[PDB]
Design an enzyme around this catalytic site. Sequence first.
Site, short mmCIF file in Angstrom:
data_model
loop_
_atom_site.label_atom_id
_atom_site.label_comp_id
_atom_site.label_asym_id
_atom_site.label_seq_id
_atom_site.Cartn_x
_atom_site.Cartn_y
_atom_site.Cartn_z
N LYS A 71 4.96 3.20 -9.74
CA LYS A 71 5.02 1.80 -9.33
C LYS A 71 5.17 1.64 -7.83
O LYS A 71 5.10 0.51 -7.33
CB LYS A 71 6.18 1.09 -10.05
CG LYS A 71 5.94 0.80 -11.53
CD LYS A 71 4.55 0.22 -11.78
CE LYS A 71 4.54 -0.82 -12.90
NZ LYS A 71 4.26 -0.23 -14.24
N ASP A 105 8.22 -7.26 -3.89
CA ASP A 105 7.44 -6.86 -5.08
C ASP A 105 6.07 -7.55 -5.10
O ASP A 105 5.02 -6.90 -5.29
CB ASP A 105 8.23 -7.23 -6.35
CG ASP A 105 7.47 -6.92 -7.62
OD1 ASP A 105 6.99 -5.77 -7.73
OD2 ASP A 105 7.35 -7.82 -8.51
N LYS A 124 2.16 -6.03 -4.77
CA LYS A 124 1.08 -6.36 -5.69
C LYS A 124 -0.11 -7.02 -4.98
O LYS A 124 -1.24 -6.90 -5.44
CB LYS A 124 1.58 -7.26 -6.82
CG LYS A 124 2.46 -6.49 -7.80
CD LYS A 124 3.18 -7.43 -8.74
CE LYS A 124 4.07 -6.64 -9.70
NZ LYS A 124 5.21 -7.48 -10.13
N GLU A 132 -4.09 2.91 -14.24
CA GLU A 132 -3.96 1.64 -14.99
C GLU A 132 -2.50 1.29 -15.26
O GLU A 132 -2.09 0.16 -15.06
CB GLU A 132 -4.70 1.72 -16.33
N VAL A 157 -0.92 -0.09 -12.15
CA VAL A 157 -1.33 -1.44 -11.71
C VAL A 157 -0.79 -2.58 -12.61
O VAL A 157 -0.66 -3.71 -12.15
CB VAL A 157 -2.86 -1.53 -11.60
#
Lengths: 399, 388
Positions: A106, A190, A194, A130, A133
């Site tokens: 992560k 965070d 992303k 995957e 993400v």
Amino acid sequence: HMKKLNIALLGLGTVGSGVVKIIEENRQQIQDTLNKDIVIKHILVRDKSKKRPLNISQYHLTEDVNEILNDDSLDIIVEVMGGIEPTVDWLRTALKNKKHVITANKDLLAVHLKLLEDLAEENGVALKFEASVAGGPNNISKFMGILNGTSNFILSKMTKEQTTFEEALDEAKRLGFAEADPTDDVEGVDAARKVVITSYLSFNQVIKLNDVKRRGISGVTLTDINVADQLGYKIKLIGKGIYENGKVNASVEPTLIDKKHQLAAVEDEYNAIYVIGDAVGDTMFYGKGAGSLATGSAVVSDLLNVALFFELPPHFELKTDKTREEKSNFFVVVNHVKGSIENFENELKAILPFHRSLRVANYDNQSYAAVIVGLESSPEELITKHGYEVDKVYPVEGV
Amino acid sequence: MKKLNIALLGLGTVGSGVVKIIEENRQQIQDTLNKDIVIKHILVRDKSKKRPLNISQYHLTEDVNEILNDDSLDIIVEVMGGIEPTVDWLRTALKNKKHVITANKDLLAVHLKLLEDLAEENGVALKFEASVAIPIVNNISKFMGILNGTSNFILSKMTKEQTTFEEALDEAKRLGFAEADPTDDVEGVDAARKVVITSYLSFNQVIKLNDVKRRGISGVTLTDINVADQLGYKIKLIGKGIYENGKVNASVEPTLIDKKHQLAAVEDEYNAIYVIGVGDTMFYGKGAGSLATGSAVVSDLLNVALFFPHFELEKSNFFVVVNHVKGSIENFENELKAILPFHRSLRVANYDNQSYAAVIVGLESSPEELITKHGYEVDKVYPVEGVL
């Protein structure tokens, strides 16, 4: 006939334990349905002495990552450990040794995904991320997203229950949405990670975390929420990537969203990515963030995929689009304003460069707010040099 | 270089797009993958017609047997539409050991199932690309969707601009969203087809178009919209599939949707599919356009070129409109309380002169027959969704 797939796991937290459980309960089926026998040959852990469930005791645990990296019988390395250092180097070595790598790490950012992807292609092996993400998922020019559940939950609580940020955060702690140190969530870190990841996947461009202009939600007040409301907007923490003229401009910040916009309705811990492109219509994906079970589940899916394909820039071009055929908006809060709201409005009409619309609202005692649609750039400096105390400026979207 | 010989069935906007795409990626598919894609034949209905692909370099034919009997072909790409004779064409192709990629918008679950099995049986791939937001890409116990742009556009117009259905439909005709006979859209037929497809993909169960309980939007009035609004709901044409006890119950009909529900905000020609199983999820967007469909076809095409789950560990709500009611709203409410079977909650609203509406939460089935047998005149009943 059965082909043995020898794998190793790096790490054994909730996600690693989940991967193991999922492999065990489906092993028989993966054998029968696909004639591959997955053997978890090593598990790397920090502490080999730790008391662990009985099912873990049957696997070979090690604290020495070189034991795994030098085992030539291994076909695939599954990393669920987290970290950039030394973790990324581990994965580099694995790829150079011709091992497929599946990671749910992560902490990986675009710089890391790029270098690992190339290294994998270079060594004729797969890199799958995957699980890394984690939930939502040609030519995208912009995305806007609600990318952090805790932050969104807090804003929804403030809005719906008319509480202060402090009260809403405490409530989110009590209910298990926020952690005891919630900084990573409420300061927008965070979400910024992303945005880096989403930018890499949307635009095939690498940016650094530090290129994301970031502001959290801890300065959003109930007054901001209610004044936005009266003007026709909700407040959301939005992570945004705009790809214009070969350059990504990326940000995370409190943003007013028109109430009719699809993002305006995304409440509580739900997330969403709204995607804009040429020429197509807009699209959006909505859902909550992945838990351990879903992450573990994604890891095993990736694992099976690579097993299936045992013995790349997409750059699928248009146009094509040839055959068959960007202003900014702002919410500005000014304090210590003498004179009426009409006078503030009139002054703004005189000083602002050309724009599409202007609406003003009472904010607090001697404070007013303005939403200005269709400026080329922030009017903050301009308003400041005309003698107004600018408390803050939030972007405005969905206009 | 591995030569991939393909044929296209049809050359409309989607077929032309497939060709253009590929042409401009051919060099890249050659260089970066092993493969040289040759479009050897294109089936068209009329070789005389002018097109989006300009005057061009491919072999056009009007004889499908010229394609089906060409053993050098590896893959058939069908973008023609139709059930007959189209499905038989694909059956022949699969039996002749040709991979099939189709973007045929008229296929239903019965057809996808029989083609999928025929493909597996003959050791070849069947790839299907339908574009409601790409279906196969986009477990599940329930889905609810806004699946027809024209119908949604009309309801949004009525709601936002306070026009009658007739005015809103005329406005959709002038803007090109609705056709002169708009039946397929306003009677919910298009949405029903997409419910069949979505049910197949979501539940792996085949239902027929006629199993979808279907009612269109032509009877929705501004009064319905405004009463729903005061009650906390929008009105949408919702396509719905609920998979309970091995059985799919599928429907398309005007539905009150709680204003807080993600589907309530989906306006104009936008569509969305909301999936329940694990948090809810939703995919939102307009119907995939030709370029995206063509783009998906070429992806599928490259996939076929390149490549050829035990995780251990419902009541209904109704909006009822009653006419010719004598007496007050309080008395109607009291009468309803007495006649209804046990339910969770009841609220009543004025609708029109001597007409009242009720939203009833937590019944097993429509109270329409019951209310009728007590001597009331029921105008209509719409389901109510998004209730917490």
